[PDB]
Structures are given as C-alpha cells and as structure tokens.
Amino acid sequence: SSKVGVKINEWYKYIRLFSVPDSEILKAEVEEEIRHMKEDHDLLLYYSLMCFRHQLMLDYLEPKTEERPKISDLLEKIESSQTDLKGILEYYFNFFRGMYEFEQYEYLNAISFYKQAERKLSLVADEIERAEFHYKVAEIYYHMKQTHMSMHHIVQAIDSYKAHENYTVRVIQCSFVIGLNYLDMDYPEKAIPHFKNALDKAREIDMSRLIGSSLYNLGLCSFAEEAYEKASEYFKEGIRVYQDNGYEHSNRILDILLMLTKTTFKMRNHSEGISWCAHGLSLSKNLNDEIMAKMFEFIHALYVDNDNEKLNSILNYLELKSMLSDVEDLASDAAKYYNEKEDHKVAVAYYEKVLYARKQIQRG
C-alpha cells in the first residue's frame, strides 16, 4: 500500500497544479494499482477522496450539463466510510467535504467542515497543501464578508504559492480574494491593481474562466465607483469570455449577468434592464440555481413592479441561506431606489434592513 499511497499523493499534487493531463494519467495509474492490491479500507477511502477532489477540478475547468452527476456517486461512496477516521486522511475528508459544501452554497456546513480540517493542520507538512487550506478558508470568509478573517488566511496562502513555481492559477485566485476584500472595505482603487494583475496573468496562461472573472471583478470596482458605463463594459466582455469558451452554463456566469442587470437599471435603461434580468432569470432556472434565481427575482420586483412583500421574502430567504452580504447589497439597492423615488418611508425600511445585515455580519 505505500506504493499506491505515493501515487495518490502525486495525483493530488497535479490536481493542485491544475495539470489535467497529469492528473488523468495518475488517476488511471491508481485505478490500475487498486485492481490488484485490493485489500485496504483506508487506501480505498483516500482513493475515493482523490476521485472526489479530481472531479472538483474537472467541474471547475469544464462544467458538465439530466444524468446523476459523477460528483454525487463519489460523495455517496465517500460518506459510507466515516467511522474510525484519523490522521491526514481525516483532514482530507473534512477539507474536501468542506469544498464540496461550499460549491453547493451550503455555507454553514462548509465552515463546519473547514474548522474540523483546521484542527489537524499541524499534520500537514506540505506548505503548498496548507496554502490550499488557507486559500479555501479565505474564500468562504470573503463570501461571508468576514474581511479580516479572510485577509488573515489569504496572505498566508499567497506567500506560500508565490514562493513556488507554477501555482499561477491559485496566485490569480488569491489576487481575486485580496482585491475583493479591499472592495468590501470601500477601497475600489486599492482593489483594481490586484484584479489588473490577475487579468494579465489570466491572459498569459490563456485561461478564459479566469479572464472572464477578472473582468467581472473589475466591473465590480467601476460599479462601486458609479462608473456604470465602464462597469457595464466589463460585465459584458466577461460574459462574452465565458460564453465563447465553454462556460455559458457555469453557474458563476449568473453573477456577471446579475451585476450587468443592476448596472443597466442604474443607467436608467429600463427596457434593457428587464431584458437582461429575464435572461439571467431564465438561465438561473435552467441551471437549477434557486439562489441566483431569487436575486434576479429581487431586482425585477424592485425596479419593475415594486413588489416589496416579495423583496422582503427574498431578503429573509437569503438570510436563511447565511448569505448576509447579498442581503446587504440587495437591501441597499432597494433603499437607494426608494430614496431616489422620494418614497422615504419605504427607503427607511430597507436602510434598517441594511443596518440589520451589517450587524449580523459583524456578529461573526
């Protein structure tokens, strides 16, 4: 078993390097070795965990569109061997499960898993593997708008990654997290260099997904600066990048469509805003993303028919999904809309919701 265990370690190394050809080679090698040794319950779980992690990489690089996804059968195979776990295998189990939960918008489960992984971090001698942990922990803290916690882990990650060679993908992703934390501190001019750096690296390694994401993150800065026409240009080109290189069905394209929709209404192009909102809504429904659909439903209910009962119900829903930053962003949109319309009694209510969300966020 040490021989097969080394191979699975090698496999994981290539996954972290985003070298799909090597990962597939190692995957096929491991499966050949398994078919002969075939006598080790832990080695098999490590195998199923790496299968899991490998698919996570593939789903990020090529999103697959009726059939039970490969990720679900692997997750089932992995959740049957939870008793008597120990050592680094236990760290992997909780870390990989945390990653999966994060991809399903199961934020509380994800922190729960990550925190269990954190306890065994002194078991992880590999500095690059610890960087993976810190990067992924920083990411979820950013999505929870735990800015200081997020920066605390992200700096640890990027130093490790920047100390090695060929972790370019993760270095871009760390630049995303750093920049986005500055944006959450109201420093869009501090965020832009990080995203411009990422965009340049994303173009050098010709990774369309990261190119489209850099343009989106830049569009978010212009939006914050109220440079709405420039934000709109960034959002459109990012959408085009995604749509032209096989990511037209990536759930994360919905973020760019959402912000373009908001942007179009901010420029008072009412009809175009509805058009974008409806396209984003339809795609959300076709990608079976309930959470994204709700956000498109909110913007439409805000700018089109002023359905405040529906706005309130959506804000409550996102809070139950532990997505307080979106509660804050969406309540802020409604507050500012009703303020401009001089419906100040309604604007007050949404400002109170913005204040409530910020307090929930600060409560940690």
């Binding site: 990020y60 950013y142 993908v169 995303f176 986005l180 994401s213 989106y216 978010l220 979106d326």
Partner: peptide, 6 residues
Amino acid sequence: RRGHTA
C-alpha cells in the same frame, strides 16, 4: 453580489 473567488 460577491465577486469571483474561483
């Protein structure tokens, strides 16, 4: 909306 963290 949250930025892209990939």
